[PDB]
Amino acid sequence: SGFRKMAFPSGKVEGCMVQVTCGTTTLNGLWLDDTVYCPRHVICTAEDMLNPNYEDLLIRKSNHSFLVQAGNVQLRVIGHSMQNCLLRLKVDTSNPKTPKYKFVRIQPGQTFSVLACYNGSPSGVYQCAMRPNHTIKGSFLNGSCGSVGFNIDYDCVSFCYMHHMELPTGVHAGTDLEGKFYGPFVDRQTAQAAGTDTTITLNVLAWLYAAVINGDRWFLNRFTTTLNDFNLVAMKYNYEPLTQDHVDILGPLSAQTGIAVLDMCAALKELLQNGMNGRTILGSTILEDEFTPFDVVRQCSGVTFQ
Amino acid sequence: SGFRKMAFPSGKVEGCMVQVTCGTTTLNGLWLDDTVYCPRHVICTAEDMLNPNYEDLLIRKSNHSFLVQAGNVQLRVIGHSMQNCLLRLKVDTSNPKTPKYKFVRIQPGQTFSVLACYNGSPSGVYQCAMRPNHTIKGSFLNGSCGSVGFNIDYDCVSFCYMHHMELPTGVHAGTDLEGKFYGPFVDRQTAQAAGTDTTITLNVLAWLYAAVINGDRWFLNRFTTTLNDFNLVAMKYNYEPLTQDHVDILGPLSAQTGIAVLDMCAALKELLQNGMNGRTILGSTILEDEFTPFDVVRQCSGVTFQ
Ligand SMILES: O=C(Cn1nnc2ccccc21)N(Cc1ccsc1)c1ccc(-c2c[nH]cn2)cc1
Ligand SMILES: O=C(Cn1nnc2ccccc21)N(Cc1ccsc1)c1ccc(-c2c[nH]cn2)cc1
Numbered sequence: 001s002g003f004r005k006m007a008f009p010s011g012k013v014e015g016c017m018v019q020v021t022c023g024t025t026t027l028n029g030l031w032l033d034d035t036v037y038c039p040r041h042v043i044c045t046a047e048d049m050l051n052p053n054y055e056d057l058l059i060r061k062s063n064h065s066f067l068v069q070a071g072n073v074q075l076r077v078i079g080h081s082m083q084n085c086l087l088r089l090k091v092d093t094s095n096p097k098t099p100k101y102k103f104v105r106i107q108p109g110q111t112f113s114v115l116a117c118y119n120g121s122p123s124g125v126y127q128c129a130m131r132p133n134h135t136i137k138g139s140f141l142n143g144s145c146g147s148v149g150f151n152i153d154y155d156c157v158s159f160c161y162m163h164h165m166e167l168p169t170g171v172h173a174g175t176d177l178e179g180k181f182y183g184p185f186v187d188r189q190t191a192q193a194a195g196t197d198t199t200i201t202l203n204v205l206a207w208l209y210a211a212v213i214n215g216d217r218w219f220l221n222r223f224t225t226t227l228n229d230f231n232l233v234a235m236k237y238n239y240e241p242l243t244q245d246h247v248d249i250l251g252p253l254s255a256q257t258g259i260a261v262l263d264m265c266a267a268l269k270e271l272l273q274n275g276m277n278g279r280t281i282l283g284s285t286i287l288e289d290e291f292t293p294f295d296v297v298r299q300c301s302g303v304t305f306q
Numbered sequence: 307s308g309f310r311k312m313a314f315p316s317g318k319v320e321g322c323m324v325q326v327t328c329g330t331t332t333l334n335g336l337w338l339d340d341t342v343y344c345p346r347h348v349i350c351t352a353e354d355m356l357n358p359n360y361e362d363l364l365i366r367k368s369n370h371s372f373l374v375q376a377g378n379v380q381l382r383v384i385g386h387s388m389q390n391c392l393l394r395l396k397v398d399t400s401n402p403k404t405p406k407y408k409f410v411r412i413q414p415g416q417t418f419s420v421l422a423c424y425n426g427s428p429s430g431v432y433q434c435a436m437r438p439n440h441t442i443k444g445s446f447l448n449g450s451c452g453s454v455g456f457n458i459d460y461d462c463v464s465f466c467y468m469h470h471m472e473l474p475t476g477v478h479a480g481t482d483l484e485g486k487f488y489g490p491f492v493d494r495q496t497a498q499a500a501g502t503d504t505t506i507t508l509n510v511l512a513w514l515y516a517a518v519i520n521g522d523r524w525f526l527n528r529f530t531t532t533l534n535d536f537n538l539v540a541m542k543y544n545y546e547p548l549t550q551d552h553v554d555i556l557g558p559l560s561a562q563t564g565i566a567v568l569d570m571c572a573a574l575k576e577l578l579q580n581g582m583n584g585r586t587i588l589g590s591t592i593l594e595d596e597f598t599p600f601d602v603v604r605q606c607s608g609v610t611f612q
Contacts, residue, residue, distance in 0.1 A: 001476035008430065124313060125314070137308060140308060170520070283443065
């Protein structure tokens with residue numbers, strides 16, 4: 001029993017973290033096989049960030065412009081190239097701790113584990129949702145750039161995020177491991193700001209299913225809803241509209257609990273209109289939206305507490 | 307910026323997890339040097355748990371009654387002994403991944419990272435407070451017994467918890483790594499129940515300091531309090547009484563923010579009496595008590611956002 005925001009075990013990723021220095025600028029890199037991946041802003045001074053031309057900054061560097069430190073060991077850079085907003089450094093040594101891995105671009109609403117790192121040294125691990133506005137509500141200080149986000153399936157690490165930026169509202173922006181930003185953000189000084197955000201409806205429904213699996217039904221009701229009538233209420237409360245694709249994804253949790261998805265939508269409508277009347281769900285006073293349907297099936301018993 | 311419930315990176319602990327089987331009973335062990343530590347209830351059938359005599363159950367076992375599996379490798383047991391509520395198995399092989407480590411008994415209100423494990427395989431990591439009632443609000447399923455809790459300081463792992471039991475309210479109980487239970491709990495079937503709990507006042511104050519370091523002052527006020535007048539309010543709201551030792555511990559956070567501890571106590575009194583008036587602190591609608599003063603200094607900037 002219980003329900004916690006649970007990260008994946010971080011060891012497979014810890015063994016891949018290194019420090020990358022270019023001049024007076026240091027941040028973290030990800031060392032897989034004979035490549036080190038890091039934010040291309042490592043080649044900038046703080047002042048270059050005002051209007052950088054990365055092509056023009058990079059052509060002025062050699063392989064020996066870059067220092068890579070793996071624990072106590074100096075790795076020698078033997079090649080370099082820019083891929084979107086990442087630098088790829090070729091090094092003379094293959095990481096012997098390289099796990100089975102993939103690069104994946106995650107979709108808004110999906111979750112991942114962040115390994116916060118400073119100077120190539122892992123400091124902490126926590127779980128993040130990718131917000132609909134393509135930010136994450138992380139916890140990052142100066143030097144955290146190049147920290148990565150990931151999921152693990154059967155000893156395969158799926159890397160999905162590299163940390164580049166904190167926006168003026170204190171939320172975080174970054175790229176996939178091809179160097180493409182999540183969202184409309186850029187690695188230079190602009191008036192860019194986190195867009196309007198919405199509550200991840202699919203995740204709230206998954207988490208209500210988690211609460212029933214763990215034995216709690218107080219918030220259910222005798223009503224049903226159509227998808228359209230649910231969405232009129234969703235719009236009022238700044239929830240993402242529910243789609244038939246979302247209903248289909250909730251099939252397995254609906255079958256484990258015997259609560260039809262649109263009956264669980266009617267329960268959520270009543271919680272949005274009436275509030276929680278001083279009650280908790282899975283120990284929360286608010287509706288939680290940072291657990292996916294996958295997260296719930298991963299963490300909860302396969303046997304409902306009926 | 308940001309503030310998250312952050313666990314320590316789990317790799318150093320992952321390399322120590324194994325599976326221990328005695329007959330038809332399997333759970334997790336911790337492999338350090340040539341010793342495997344696990345809950346002594348591995349020697350019981352489900353029925354033995356009703357009234358076990360562990361001394362009488364153990365003397366009926368040999369070294370070869372125990373199977374230890376480290377990944378794909380069978381470790382041979384060459385000795386065994388009971389220490390309080392743990393079994394210590396001597397094995398023929400020293401764990402080459404043994405980190406620098408200590409065993410520590412943590413105090414109520416202190417935090418630690420849990421590596422949830424099944425069949426010797428790590429599944430997830432999350433941060434726990436030890437409640438004043440000596441339980442943890444974990445997330446554990448059948449097979450999780452022998453999962454451990456830990457803190458890391460400068461590459462030294464301080465192990466502080468081994469998982470034994472879920473209580474009837476769904477909260478969790480276990481031992482230190484000498485096999486002494488936290489709290490009055492026993493590894494047999496009784497009417498034992500989680501005692502009355504209280505909110506960890508020191509941790510709430512630390513987290514209000516975190517909110518000021520991160521740039522938010524909305525909840526401060528022009529008032530001060532004595533320790534006695536604060537404690538009359540604490541008693542009404544089921545908070546732990548504040549002591550002078552707690553005031554002293556908050557010295558560094560008080561100095562970083564320039565808010566006297568008893569002035570921050572007056573802010574908390576007003577939040578307890580008036581509520582949060584629809585506002586959030588560090589994104590929370592409630593007062594958070596699972597971050598210690600140490601946790602706040604570890605995670606927050608050393609520079610207040612003034
Ligand atoms: O946001 C960042 C870097 N960053 N990321 N996470 C952080 C958390 C706390 C503080 C700073 C953080 N910027 C701001 C910026 C400016 C234009 S685009 C983005 C940032 C600041 C300095 C540098 C830099 C490059 N070279 C030396 N310093 C790069 C990014
Ligand atoms: O609570 C446990 C074991 N346990 N720990 N975390 C859990 C989470 C979900 C389900 C069970 C969990 N017990 C109950 C108990 C009974 C007397 S004392 C404690 C438990 C159940 C069975 C066994 C057992 C021993 N041998 C075979 N099964 C041991 C503990």
